[PDB]
């Protein structure tokens, strides 16, 4: 799609840098605008980036730090909105870019438009044509008061620009590389123009510059994109006849999402009231799930019945990972709104507080579990547990919650066998990356591309147990397992059961007239009778 | 040719200011770094700052980080050097010299016929 | 700041003859030096640039050589067109600094 999630991983290096460069690769190719922060780190030389050539827009910051490559493809990047800020006052960090390797030109010849935080480049030794750029003219009228810390410490020299930019303002060598005003030359009060006449002043709803004096002639929109129309919202959901005021329903009516007015959520969103695309309801308002599949948000007038918090979210904010002292909060729990993370420290208890360590059979309390909104992540599991069974029922990650912005799914560093999430049929969003796992089998035999949800989405798997090691031993899907789906040995890990399933077991057949219990047939499911 | 050409020899009270300008022409002026040099009379030579015009960027040294303030004009091509607050350590000819090839090297060529700065009362 | 030192600080020779001017710095450069020759009412020109690299126009008599902490000057056959203060400047960091000059007097 046109629309991608960014990362949210920043400076920290990649648990699995096998994988690291093929995520950037299914997050962002073909993505024009993406929703969070471009993140571009610890990225070889020999790396191929062009899927980064059709990004135009970033709603946070732009991370480029710790790469060795000389060349980041932004050239088509318009506007940074900056929402988010990386040290809060940054929407493009360019740090520690060399080791020859090492970033020479930037190269965002596009970039015209920076509506909220600063610029901070610095330890850049193969940099050029930094100080050449009149940042100024970035920066939005309302963040005319936006910092710049540029280093300009060189162990290069640097050609001067080409000589058609005028003013000697670029983003490269070559004469595409020249820098295009629109602000700091426009006539009157204009924010933004496309020349320094008063004809050539572009709309007020313009962002990054204008083609025309019309609102349907920006490069940008400063707030919202109504179908090729910049606005300042986006038309109402109701509209209030005039007399009594009685609310109906309006045709024209438009779902806020990101900076762009949607006629309908996109998937694994959620529909307010106010008439808006989030991920978390607003404060008590419970998820009612239509018919056809669709949900939203609606407020309660009387105090919402309770919930079950995963971390990340409410009393469960600032918990790192699911312990013995929060373990008891997930009981009976068939949804979880927030993530659950299992770390080391998990299973090793508090000294000071005689709380025991986690046990094993304290994990069957998600036995109940069903519906994880955030993510799953395992970086953490008990040697004597072979498998994810304890989540044996757990059907949907929606992963409206990424573990580093990305990953909805995380399996890293595990002694399980296999994985045993026999219940799983949905991964929302988000990616999935299973690594290190030196005894995991069965993760081939798992229809992966089912789960997913969008085209952005794949799985990174790396360092596990060898397929040909699998497959030389007894290791192999059920004959009962349907097209070879398995989540794991035996006839109780079928994705789909080639007939007649009995209980969790699959067998060949249920025993309608042969003895047990007379089984009655109901859904290719074998049921007690009389 | 390529040439710079400075104005502005006189003489100024201690702890008035002076701003110094460097006409330049010949060349792109807004393509290279236009850095100014000091030398006192039987002196060496002392690097104070050098600025990017077209883009306004600076870099003085800790010696001159609270005066000699650097600016530029792409319509009338100077560099007009000031300092803020004049010693008598502070009296020597200022030159203004630019990179041969590339913008932002560090090795000058192409100097101006300086002006002479006497800070006396 | 990295201090530049210059030997000798001042040095007379008949004409013909080979001028070694060594430079010395407080910390080792990578061939970042840079020559200069200011005649008493004049600007300086530079002569060669980033040690060995000869600037155009100059002489082909003026060589450059050395790395690290030392390094030398050379006039393969001294002028009485070469009566002037030479400078060596170093290109490593913010700030560049100078020398404090070799004024080299030809002799007749």
């Known amino acids: 799609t046109q629309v991608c999630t960014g990362t949210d991983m920043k400076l920290r290096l990649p648990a699995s840098p096998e994988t690291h460069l093929d995520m950037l690769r299914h997050l962002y190719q073909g993505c024009q605008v993406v929703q969070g922060n471009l993140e571009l780190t610890y990225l070889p030389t020999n790396a191929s980036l062009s899927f980064l050539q059709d990004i135009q827009e970033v709603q946070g910051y732009v991370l480029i730090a710790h790469n060795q490559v000389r060349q980041v493809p932004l050239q088509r990047l318009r506007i940074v909105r900056g929402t988010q800020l990386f040290e809060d006052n940054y929407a493009l960090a360019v740090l520690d870019n060399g080791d020859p390797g090492g970033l020479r030109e930037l190269q965002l010849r596009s970039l015209t438009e920076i509506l909220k935080g600063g610029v901070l480049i610095q330890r850049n030794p193969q940099l050029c044509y930094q100080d050449t750029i009149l940042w100024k003219d970035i920066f939005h009228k309302n963040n005319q008061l936006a910092l710049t810390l540029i280093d300009t410490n060189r162990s290069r020299a640097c050609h001067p620009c080409s000589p058609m930019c005028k003013g000697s303002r670029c983003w490269g060598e070559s004469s595409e590389d020249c820098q295009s005003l629109t602000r700091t030359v426009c006539a009157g009060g204009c924010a933004r123009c496309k020349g320094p006449l008063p004809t050539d002043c572009c709309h007020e709803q313009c962002a990054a510059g204008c083609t025309g004096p019309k609102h349907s002639d920006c490069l940008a929109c400063l707030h919202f994109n109504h179908s090729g129309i910049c606005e300042l919202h986006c038309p109402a959901l109701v509209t209030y006849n005039t007399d009594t005021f009685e609310s109906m329903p309006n045709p024209e009516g438009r779902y806020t999402f990101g900076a762009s007015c949607v006629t309908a959520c996109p998937y694994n969103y959620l529909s307010t009231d106010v008439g808006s695309c989030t991920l978390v309801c607003p404060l008590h308002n419970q998820e009612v799930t239509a018919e056809d599949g669709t949900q939203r948000c609606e407020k309660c007038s009387k105090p919402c019945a309770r919930v079950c918090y995963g971390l990340g979210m409410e009393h469960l904010r600032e918990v790192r990972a699911v312990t013995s002292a929060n373990i008891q909060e997930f009981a009976g729990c068939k949804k979880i709104f927030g993530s659950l993370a299992f770390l080391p420290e998990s299973f090793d208890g508090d000294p000071a507080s005689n709380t025991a360590p986690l046990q094993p059979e304290q994990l069957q309390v998600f036995e109940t579990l069903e519906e994880i909104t955030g993510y799953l992540y395992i970086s953490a599991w008990p040697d004597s547990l072979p498998d994810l069974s304890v989540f044996q029922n757990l059907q949907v990650i929606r992963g409206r919650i990424l573990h580093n912005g990305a990953y909805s799914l995380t399996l890293q560093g595990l002694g399980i066998s296999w994985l045993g999430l026999r219940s799983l049929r949905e991964l929302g969003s988000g990616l999935a990356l299973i690594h290190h796992n030196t005894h995991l089998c069965f993760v081939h035999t798992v229809p992966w591309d089912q789960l997913f949800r969008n085209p952005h989405q794949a799985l990174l798997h790396t360092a596990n147990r060898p397929e040909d090691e699998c497959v030389g031993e007894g290791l192999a899907c059920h004959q009962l397992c349907a097209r070879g789906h398995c989540w794991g040995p035996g006839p109780t890990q079928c994705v789909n059961c080639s007939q007649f399933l009995r209980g969790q077991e699959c067998v060949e057949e249920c025993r309608v007239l042969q003895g047990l219990p007379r089984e009655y047939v109901n859904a290719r499911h074998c049921l007690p009778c009389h | 040719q390529v040439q710079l050409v400075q104005s502005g020899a006189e003489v100024k009270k201690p702890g008035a200011s002076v701003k110094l300008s460097c006409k330049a022409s010949?060349?792109?002026?807004?393509?290279?770094?236009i850095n100014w040099v000091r030398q006192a009379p039987g002196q060496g030579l002392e690097w104070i700052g050098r600025?990017?015009?077209?883009?306004?960027?600076?870099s003085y040294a800790q010696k001159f980080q609270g005066r000699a303030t650097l600016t530029a004009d792409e319509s009338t091509s100077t560099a007009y050097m000031e300092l803020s607050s004049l010693r008598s350590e502070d009296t020597a000819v200022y030159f203004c010299?630019?990179?041969?090839?590339?913008?932002?090297?560090?090795?000058?060529?192409?100097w101006g016929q300086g002006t002479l700065v006497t800070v006396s009362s | 700041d990295i201090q530049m030192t210059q030997s000798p600080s001042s040095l007379s020779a008949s004409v013909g003859d080979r001028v070694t001017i060594t430079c010395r710095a407080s910390?080792?450069?990578?061939?970042?030096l840079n020559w200069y020759q200011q005649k008493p009412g004049k600007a300086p020109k530079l002569l060669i640039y980033?040690?060995?690299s000869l600037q155009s126009g100059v002489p082909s008599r003026f060589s450059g050589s050395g790395s690290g902490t030392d390094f030398t000057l050379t006039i393969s056959s001294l002028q009485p067109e070469d009566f002037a203060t030479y400078y060596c400047?170093?290109?490593?960091?913010?700030?560049?600094?100078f020398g404090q000059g070799t004024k080299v007097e030809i002799k007749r």
């Open positions: 010299a630019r990179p041969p090839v590339y913008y932002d090297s560090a090795w000058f060529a192409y």
């Open positions: 010949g060349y792109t002026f807004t393509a290279y770094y």
């Open positions: 600025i990017y015009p077209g883009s306004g960027y600076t």
């Open positions: 910390q080792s450069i990578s061939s970042y």
């Open positions: 980033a040690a060995s």
């Open positions: 400047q170093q290109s490593y960091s913010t700030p560049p600094t």
